[PDB]
Amino acid sequence: GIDPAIVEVLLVLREAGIENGATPWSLPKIAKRAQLPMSVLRRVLTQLQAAGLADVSVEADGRGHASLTQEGAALAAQLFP
């Protein structure tokens, strides 16, 4: 019964953050690795950002990057052991 798009984005963001101090991935890279159209990725990130699990950082042109918050990162490690 689980939304596979939310799960896939959580998995991709967890992978992105495994190397400490790594640059957060850009939105198109997240979309590519999650195999999601950009519109779906944006929806999922809005929901994860609302939930306090992801940071979504965009500039004036609407482009940018996203990553797990400290909350999301710690939870993702447990949810997907």
Side-chain angles (χ1 to χ4, degrees), residues 28-32 34-45:
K29 184 176 171 176
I30 298 160
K32 174 185 176 141
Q35 298 182 270
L36 292 178
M38 180 54 54
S39 57
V40 181
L41 175 65
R42 289 190 189 270
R43 184 274 289 179
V44 166
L45 292 173

Side-chain angles (χ1 to χ4, degrees), residues 51-53 68-69 71-76 78:
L53 303 181
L68 300 172
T69 55
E71 288 77 15
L75 178 73
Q78 299 147 353

Side-chain angles (χ1 to χ4, degrees), residues 6-18 22-25 30 44-45 48-49 51-57 65-69 71-80:
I6 297 168
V7 173
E8 197 65 18
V9 173
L10 283 171
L11 283 170
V12 167
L13 292 178
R14 164 168 170 61
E15 188 189 333
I18 291 293
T23 300
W25 292 5
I30 298 160
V44 166
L45 292 173
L48 295 175
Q49 197 192 29
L53 303 181
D55 188 358
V56 184
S57 289
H65 52 82
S67 49
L68 300 172
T69 55
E71 288 77 15
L75 178 73
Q78 299 147 353
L79 190 50
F80 303 110

